[PDB]
Write an enzyme that holds these catalytic residues in place. Structure first.
Site, PDB file in Angstrom:
ATOM      1  CG  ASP A   7      89.761  47.122  23.439  1.00 19.17           C
ATOM      2  OD1 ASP A   7      90.259  47.916  24.264  1.00 19.17           O
ATOM      3  OD2 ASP A   7      89.395  45.972  23.749  1.00 19.17           O
ATOM      4  CD  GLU A  48      94.403  51.625  27.319  1.00 18.86           C
ATOM      5  OE1 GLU A  48      95.150  50.894  28.001  1.00 18.86           O
ATOM      6  OE2 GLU A  48      93.180  51.409  27.179  1.00 18.86           O
ATOM      7  CG  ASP A  83      87.202  48.568  25.944  1.00 21.92           C
ATOM      8  OD1 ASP A  83      87.803  48.703  27.030  1.00 21.92           O
ATOM      9  OD2 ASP A  83      86.401  47.635  25.732  1.00 21.92           O
ATOM     10  CG  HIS A  86      88.386  42.516  23.977  1.00 21.21           C
ATOM     11  ND1 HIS A  86      89.199  43.133  24.903  1.00 21.21           N
ATOM     12  CD2 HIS A  86      88.328  41.212  24.338  1.00 21.21           C
ATOM     13  CE1 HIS A  86      89.615  42.242  25.785  1.00 21.21           C
ATOM     14  NE2 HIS A  86      89.101  41.068  25.464  1.00 21.21           N
TER      15      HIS A  86
HETATM   16 MG   LIG Z   1      89.899  45.110  25.631  1.00 21.17          MG
HETATM   17 MG   LIG Z   2      90.685  48.903  26.683  1.00 22.98          MG
END
Ligand SMILES: [Mg+2]
Ligand SMILES: [Mg+2]
Ligand SMILES: [Mg+2]
Ligand SMILES: [Mg+2]
Ligand SMILES: [Mg+2]
Ligand SMILES: [Mg+2]
Ligand SMILES: [Zn+2]
Lengths: 750, 750
Positions: free
Chosen positions: A538, A576, A608, A725
């Site tokens: 993540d 990302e 994720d 996360h």
């Molecule tokens: Mg997250």
């Molecule tokens: Mg994410």
DNA sequence: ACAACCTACTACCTCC
DNA sequence: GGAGGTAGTAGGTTGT
DNA sequence: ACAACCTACTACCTCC
DNA sequence: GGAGGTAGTAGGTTGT
């Protein structure tokens, strides 16, 4: 094991699907303007290849610039995503748009006022192909706007405006409605005082800004009449607000705003408790209200066109009826393994034997070795001085009760280190003062010199600033102290039978979180997984820079019955997109320094979001060089499809699996299903697409129950993704502990 | 102690200084366009207040938008910086511009070709007020452009273009000259193969791009004739280059380039050794050539206008004649302190007693305690496999000679730990292979398990990629190994009398750098400074994100005779602006965990660059809260003023001090003076401006001699600023070591 | 008027 | 920030 | 045609 | 990347 469920999609007419399409290549530079998606939207088409500037259009092109005819193809020769985008574009061409459906929906659901705000319904649409047919998916939402400006909100008073800006500092945003471009700005306060920055000594600049905003934009007589109706005359007694744009890159461009021309962006902080209760009862709708509203809207649509040919579709989903207590192993009073099904209890009664004798004694499964070598652990109690005296004494008494109960119930059966609480380990300081924080840090360094691990219990106020919380937790984590924070609103939750004690639910959750923060795993999972390692990835944004300090992974690993959790970091990225080559290189380095060869094994990757193409190329290069077999999944949380049922189930729709892995304990709201998509198998440098079988859904459902943060709450995401996360949430705020403590468990971010 | 020096500035006529000026306030948003500096430049004025949009103009405004008359003032009521900007703007109005002076200069210095490039002279101008008069400062520079396009450079061959793109990978930039906006692009290679990304299967897209670039920009018949003269006909055999913009934010916008339309941006990598030698002899001019060229240019100017009224001005500078060997303390062969002036040697003969007996034995001043507790330190020798066999054997023999000489000459007099070299500690691996790096990391972890510190000597190739160097050094620093890297071109420098050994200068520098990397301070400074702590601050950009992981400080501290060096980190910022509140908070925390109270002391801050207003407010808040007296200086390295002398001196000009703290050992070039400016004193929350006395210049000159990287080179910057620059260079690449090793010295970044 | 996703925050309810 | 859900607001990244 | 600075790279020369 | 200077190229931050 076969249930009919209702969804929020309707079948479209097949006479709108286009017969043949053309491809066009556009010759223009990105560095000029006129973006290719805008060219596709004005020419009633979509974009296939953004790399080669290739657009697909069902009609002949009417472009003014240079273009070239690429190919003449059919609609069935496209991928399913481009077919869905083309069908959605044709539906927006034929009058089925979001705002027109909002116009249709507002006839059955009128706008409703809450205080100084107005709530208006809204429909968001999508297109999903299933079974050879196309379905329009409709999603219900609401928009909450402000019906009054900022100057009319406070009563046209400068002191009320100052109090409104000072009270809601941190989550205050103002939108200008007197300009053509509606930009959201953030007010600028003093950095060390906290007062708003206003200019209350300029009766000439207000008139100049008023006349400039009048003459620049509202030049026609109708626009002048609308401007005089909306804003009225000029108030020369108002101040001028200093603000910056909310966008990060133009934050060094100062903006002078007038409070008469701006409106407050809606936040729930700007309401009292009662109006917040009614507005969140109003926004959260159950399944029956959504079914009735969508049925009324679709019945309104169907008597005006021939596009929608059916009502809400009913699909077939498979229920999940498996007792999860059979796969949950734990120790008994003699330290012998046992499944909670044999003890006839569940996950939620692990600590009920502490104050009762009608329940079996539950001992934890795994205790780390470093806790066994450690003789004593100091425990500190830090109390904010902004609290009332009874709240302070209650917090100290509850912390003493919690630590004493844990110490007695763990020292009577197993070998646990002694948690030392002394009278000199309790501090009552002001948290918002920098000098008190500095002196507390000096005292805690001088107290924890000849020690390796300490624990802290912090009692804060009701609304502490977010910078102070991260500063206190970072300064405690830098001096090797694991901290647990309880706020003032938590301490007001008492038991129904004993009003002088905390609620037992919060005490059990604090017990489990404190035990899990020092590496103790109370219960583990018993299942022989098909993969040796399960890695969850993540990403999160950085706090001050424009980059990504987020990006981390959590590995669940063992000999084959998964028990061990290790978090590692990707590093630092620009967007990302994970660099899988460097990630797998330090993965092989870390696991070889643990003594394990990572050659020829199988790794299941749960990401994720969506796996990018650069991640695919990196995983292919890693699989070709190091010889590892990689299986990747894609987990999606926020989408538009809704299943109108409250039960653990899964549904195979298109090439994705929508699962409901939990039940909502509330009486309001509709559960959001989780999407599994794009299972990829990478072996020897080649990436193939696979089908999601029942074993993958069952293993993801089993991984969704490994919760170490609470005993009464069921999470939606799988456990490696959830802990990834929480780990990027910890690394975003600068929270870090020593390395070999990270290698021995010690989930300090839960 | 009083010498007349010549500078590159001339006195201007006083009849161009304006009499009265007006101030105007401009009412427009930043979010529309038409930037305020452009409005000031088109209206012949400057910008005073960018916060309130206030411009100063010597004439009446001719703006089309809304404005307001602020005030009518004189030229003498402005600060000196705004007066210099106004005089520079009026000089650019009266025909004295940079490109016109370049036109005048090219009559005496013709453009010169070097291979495929062309060098053209250039004048940069500035305005400096001194003694009530204004002086125009002229600076000589050169511009090197490409006279041929990329397709004509390689001979219009695809394989030659591929070899040119593959050979210069990493520092290749292409500028498009066929468009109106000349944007510099970077070519895109394969991430794991390294080949250029070209499309050699499109004979139709080349014609389309050619016709599009012809019809869009070059539309007039004169522009069509210029386009056909410059680029010629269309070549359909050329490939299409995939490139991204050099600007970071639009890097996700792919650009298709033609090699006929682009030129290569100049780099010295694209030349052979001979042409590089003549071009760097040509670019670097001595003081007499600059004096003659500026005198010819000024004599050309003065017979065309009445603005320049004098020749090159002669100022008065004070020489520095202080023997620095009196303030340099060191130990003798009895471990007794002594100044090198008593031993009648200098800094550069510290290691000549190792292989000779006619020189005194020199022992280091300070040895860390952790080196005394450590019994053995492993030493590894890593050799790149791309080298020839004789170079590999010579590198191993030189490393053995170096470690054996250090071990004998240190073990015969003082208590030093044993450096262990075994036959299993020598590895010969390929550095560009990821698997070899991973296996070497696994082997070094398995070898350094029961150890706390190790040393590595790496021998690399001639041109190693910059990612591999940072990866190897980061993976060695993560496993607690201090590394020293020697390249192939260094190993070819042999002694003049012994061709089979390395040059003795490089061996002594490697000895001193290896000793300084493990915390050993050979010589210290003896001076009672007026400040208790000296903190140097510097910032550097992050590698992948758009932010600043740079920002760190180096503290020189002791009881009053400065000996101790500790580096600390600011953290992470968004721009170039240090948060001094957090920096001083963890400074007080770190120095109180060392046992020192930081209340009521004096701290001298040397900042690389300029102190911003946010840093000033943070230092004022820190001085008000914690009660510390702060003295800040501003150090400037890159400016336009040049002093035509080669001697240690200083010159008081305007409110700044331009010092030459070193002599240039080369026969070509003019030394760049260092600027001290804006000495600020912050005490109890108030910031006052001070005057730079002789003691501050003397202390900065004394701090400019504390070099721990070499014994034969004199640096320009002071030592805390230099070590802060090396520390942000280390933290940018991800290089980090343990904390208590950082607290005991251990300058691992030198 | 580019879509389909992803962060960062605020608020309520419900568990043994 | 007892931990987990659902609601809202504002932005930002990726398609190939 | 906004100035005065600051990074990141490439290249040569010179030290005991 | 023996370490320090001087030369060139491209960008990016701050004035208040
Ligand atoms: Mg997250
Ligand atoms: Mg994410
Ligand atoms: Mg927590
Ligand atoms: Mg700097
Ligand atoms: Mg620097
Ligand atoms: Mg070095
Ligand atoms: Zn950015």
């Amino acid at each position: 094991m076969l249930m009919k469920v209702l969804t929020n999609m309707v079948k479209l007419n097949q006479d709108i699907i286009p017969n043949e399409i053309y491809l066009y290549k556009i010759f223009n530079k990105p560095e000029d303007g006129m973006n290719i998606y805008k060219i596709a939207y004005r020419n009633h088409g979509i974009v296939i290849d953004p790399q080669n500037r290739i657009i697909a259009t069902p009609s002949e092109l009417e472009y003014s610039g240079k273009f070239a005819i690429e190919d003449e193809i059919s609609f069935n020769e496209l991928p399913e995503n481009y077919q869905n985008r083309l069908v959605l574009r044709i539906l927006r061409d034929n009058g089925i748009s979001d705002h027109a459906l909002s116009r249709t929906l507002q006839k059955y659901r009128k706008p409703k006022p809450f205080g100084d705000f107005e709530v208006i319904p809204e429909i968001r649409s999508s297109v999903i192909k299933h079974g050879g047919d196309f379905y329009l998916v409709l999603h219900l939402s609401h928009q909450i706007r402000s019906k009054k400006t900022l100057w009319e909100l406070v009563g046209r008073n400068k002191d009320a405006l100052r109090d409104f800006l000072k009270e809601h500092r941190g989550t205050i945003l103002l939108r200008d409605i007197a300009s053509e471009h509606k930009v959201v700005y953030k007010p600028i306060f003093k950095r060390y005082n906290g007062d708003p920055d206003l200019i209350e000594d300029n009766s000439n600049d207000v008139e100049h800004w008023y006349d400039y905003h009048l003459e620049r934009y509202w030049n026609t007589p109708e626009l002048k009449k609308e401007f005089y109706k909306k804003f009225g005359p000029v108030d020369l007694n108002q101040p001028i607000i200093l603000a910056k744009p909310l966008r990060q890159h133009n934050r060094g461009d100062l903006v002078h705003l007038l409070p008469q021309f701006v409106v407050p962006v809606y936040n729930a902080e700007q309401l009292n408790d009662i109006l917040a209760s009614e507005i969140l009862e109003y926004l959260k709708l159950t399944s029956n209200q959504r079914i009735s509203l969508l049925s009324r809207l679709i019945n309104d649509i169907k008597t005006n066109t021939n596009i929608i040919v059916s009502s809400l579709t009913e699909l077939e989903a498979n229920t999940f009826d498996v007792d999860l207590n059979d796969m949950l192993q734990v120790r008994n009073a003699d330290n012998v393994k046992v499944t909670l099904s044999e003890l006839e209890i569940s996950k939620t009664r692990l600590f009920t034997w502490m104050k009762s004798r009608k329940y079996p004694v539950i001992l934890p499964y795994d205790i780390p070795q470093k806790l066994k070598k450690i003789e004593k652990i100091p425990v500190f109690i830090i109390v904010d001085s902004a609290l009332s005296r009874d709240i302070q004494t209650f917090a100290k008494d509850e912390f003493r009760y919690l630590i004493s109960s844990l110490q007695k119930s763990l020292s009577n059966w197993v070998d646990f280190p002694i948690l030392d609480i002394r009278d000199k380990y309790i501090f009552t300081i002001d948290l918002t003062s920098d000098k008190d924080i500095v002196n507390l840090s000096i005292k805690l360094v001088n107290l924890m010199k000849n020690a390796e691990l300490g624990l802290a219990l912090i009692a804060t106020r009701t609304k502490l600033p977010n910078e102070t919380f991260d500063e206190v937790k970072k300064r405690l984590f830098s001096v090797n102290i694991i901290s647990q924070v309880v706020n003032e609103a938590t301490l007001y939750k008492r038991d129904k039978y004993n009003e002088s004690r905390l609620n037992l639910y919060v005490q059990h959750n604090l017990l489990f979180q404190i035990l899990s923060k020092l590496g103790i795993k109370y219960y583990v999972l018993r299942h022989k997984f098909s993969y040796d390692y399960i890695v969850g990835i993540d990403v999160t944004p950085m706090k001050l820079s424009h980059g990504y300090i987020g990006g981390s992974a959590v590995m669940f690993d063992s000999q084959g019955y998964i028990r061990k959790i290790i978090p590692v970091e990707i590093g630092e990225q620009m967007g990302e997109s994970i660099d899988m080559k460097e990630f797998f290189k330090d993965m092989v380095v870390q696991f070889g320094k643990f003594g394990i060869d990572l050659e020829g094994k199988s790794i299941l990757i749960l990401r994720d979001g969506k796996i990018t193409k650069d991640e695919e190329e990196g995983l292919a290069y890693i699989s070709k060089v190091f010889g590892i077999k990689i299986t990747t999944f894609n987990i999606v949380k926020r989408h538009l499809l809704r299943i109108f049922a409250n039960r653990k189930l899964y549904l195979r729709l298109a090439n994705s699996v929508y699962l409901l892995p939990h039940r909502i304990k509330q009486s309001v709201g509709t559960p959001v299903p989780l999407k599994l998509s794009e299972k990829r198998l990478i072996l020897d440098g080649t990436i193939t697409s696979q089908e999601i079988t029942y074993n993958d859904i069952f293993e993801i459902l089993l991984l969704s129950e490994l919760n170490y943060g609470s005993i009464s709450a069921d999470m939606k995401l799988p456990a490696p993704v959830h802990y990834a996360h929480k780990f990027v949430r910890a690394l975003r705020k600068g929270w870090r502990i020593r390395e070999e403590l990270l290698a021995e468990g010690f989930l300090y971010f839960v």
